[PDB]
Amino acid sequence: LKNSSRSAVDPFIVMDVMEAARRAEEAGRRIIHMEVGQPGTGAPRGAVEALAKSLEGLPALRQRIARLYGEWYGVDLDPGRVVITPGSSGGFLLAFTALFDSGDRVGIGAPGYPSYRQILRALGLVPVDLPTAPENRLQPVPADFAGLDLAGLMVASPANPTGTMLDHAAMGALIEAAQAQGASFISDEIYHGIEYEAKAVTALELTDECYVINSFSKYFSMTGWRVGWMVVPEDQVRVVERIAQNMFICAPHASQVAALAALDCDAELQANLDVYKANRKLMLERLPKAGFTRIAPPDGAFYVYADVSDLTDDSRAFAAEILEKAGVAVTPGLDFDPERGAGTLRFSYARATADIEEGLDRLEAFMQAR
Template sequence: MNLNQLAARLQHIAPFHVMELSKKAAVLEQQGRHLIHMGIGEPDFTAPPAVVEAATRAMTEGKMQYTSATGLPQLRAAISDHYRSVYGLEIAPERIVVTAGASAALLLACAALVERDSEVLMPDPSYPCNRHFVAAFEGRAKLIASGPEHRFQLSAQMVREHWGSATRGVLLASPSNPTGTSILPDELRAIVGEVRQRGGFTIVDEIYQGLSYEGAPFSALSLGDDVVVINSFSKYFNMTGWRLGWLVLPPALVPQVEKLAQNLLICASSIAQHAAVACFTPQTLALYEERKAEFKRRRDYIVPALESLGFTVPVMPDGAFYVYADCSALADDADQLSLDMLNEAGVVLVPGLDFGPFTARRYIRLSYATSMENLQEAVARLRVFFEKRRKAA
């Protein structure tokens, strides 16, 4: 194939820079090095026994055919009931579209709402795939520098200042990857108001909403039926490889997204859908809450531990399982520091480069989705690493 025939949109979709770090880590492990991985955003917990049993039962009973493009009715009803019991919201099951992970949900939302050359506002730093979904539909992600004073999130004032003639909407994440910070409810309400006033769309990625550690449960769905919300079974529900998520849509948008799903995806895995119904039993939800408490315990350990090493954590992460730490007091370049920590200490962390240029060189992202023992061992290794650097300076 002549590479000149490739679609021009590929030029606007960058690879994960962190994959180069992962390749180096794999080489070290092949050489016999023991590494502690704190880069991957994946729970170390797996699907609860009831969920696995439901999947086994579905296969045994032959429930492996295509489902509706919008998902199993019983799963959509279970998600609706969950919104009622946890958030006090009445979300009609008909507004819920089950997808092949949150990635497919973002794909469908952008396919429905992003036009060629239209702009979508999002914060810098933010999860890189979000801007790449926009680019895939020939839109442009407009990254707005957001520091700790704004919790690394967009504000209503930023929306007012940066909304232009080509702007079509905003894509937010609360809590966020890489920062673990949420948009405060009043600020999110103001953002939605600004976007609504301009006739735009608001997409809110809430895949970490179940892992919020402070305050009462809150969803952007409480701000109006015109807000598009994305969620997933990967994080709170510990089902990463099952590839299952969902969209909550304005009623008028459901048939349009259903049409897209029928053509692009057919449906999410039927086995994963049957299994996911078991996520919402009282016993399984109680287990998820225990695991959530364990994530919070890890957060409460790792943040002061990082600060004792010389990192600065300017905003306490209130959700997800990430810490976004300023390393500028320790090194001039987060990329090089990440490589040095990998090679010398055997600790894998993610530099800020993937998440946008504003914080790229001075921040690292740490995932505490690993055992407390691993976190403690990583801190011990890093303490030795930085002591050696100070002595050598």
């Protein structure tokens, strides 16, 4: 069988460390997992209870999400504009299908989420990586795409892998600039909720002419459940609905029952966030001490993105050495930034505080002996 061009997506560099981590554990070694981009926790107890009862999208879930926009952002949102998706992959599929045609160019910041470029290519679209600068908080600025003919622009705040966020001014400027050159604006708000001192800004606070993509996988701690949502303009709901119907793309009902309930599990989800707050405090104090002195500001999410060019020429080899010798799994930067990632690393602090404490001890000892 002959394969297509769109099928030649790139294998994730992080697979070397994750498999090596699995091999380490099979041989008997406890590894501290600082490589995963998912919460250490499962679905909140109230979500699990709700599903268990039922065993013994959804209008109520759309309505509950709409309420979240008022309570979190002071945005009055019609639930008719909330589309329930099978997660963020589903949201990206639906957004890109609604908005772009074969060969359309879509601007994405580098460093960024590895799957953006791959999903765009897989659909016959053209990802255009925008190398972002430290002085710009590793977020795109209008100048980054003023020279580029783009059909769309995608931004993330808090971002993977950096944790950096876009404040109201930064988001406004981006939206104004996108709109002015005909680039459809997509706001990835998947890590909203996982926030420290900076307040997340929904693109809905600045415009309705945007697609917002979200998920229950992060703050709501339902990674694995394949449920999320998107918000689209009033005039775009029917476009999305027909695609979702005609392509049968929707969240499992079991997952929708759980997510409805998860939205009211504020106490548990804030407890998870207290853990992230404690771990972040530890990362910020102890990583410099270990030799990781150049990091992007971890405004939100649970990542630290480090420039390690003083320590190594090849973050892939360096991550492998950290695993072998320190028993700590970290992610090379190459998946996020193919041009500059050989000199960067991403740490995740989504695990228990004791695991982070342990990870930092291991890192410190390794870097001393190195």
